[PDB]
């Protein structure tokens, strides 16, 4: 709820670290993920990094975006892209870039045919 446009640009940029963090939190928590506490921190820390620079301004757009990309993390058919990120497969910077018909492509060969050890 709000009355009016008022707002501090920090804020907004602060709140997404811990929403994010949150995610990949309840997500690795729950995925048995030997990961540091740190490593969702620093991603998401990073994704801000990226995304207001990227973007350079705070405006509507870069809320889509970033709405966009925790999206398809929270969501129940993508399983693997919080794992993308965490694991490293996937940078904060770049995961920016990927297409939204892409994040779910939840293709593996794509990233490197250099290693198969067939985890499935």
């Not at 670290?17 to 995610?23: N, Y």
Request: glycine share 4%; hydrophobic share 30%; charged share 35%.
């Amino acid at each position: 709820g709000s009355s009016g446009s008022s707002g501090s640009a920090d804020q907004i940029r602060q709140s997404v670290r811990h929403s994010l963090k949150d995610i990949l939190m309840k997500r690795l928590t729950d995925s048995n993920l030997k990961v540091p506490e740190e490593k969702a921190a620093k991603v998401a820390t990073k994704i801000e990094k990226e995304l207001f620079s990227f973007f350079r301004d705070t405006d509507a757009k870069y809320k889509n975006k970033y709405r966009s990309l925790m999206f398809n993390l929270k969501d129940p058919k993508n399983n693997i892209l919080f794992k993308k990120v965490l694991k490293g497969e996937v940078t904060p910077d770049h995961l920016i870039r990927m297409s939204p018909e892409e994040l779910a492509s939840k293709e593996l060969a794509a990233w490197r045919r250099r290693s198969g050890p067939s985890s499935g």
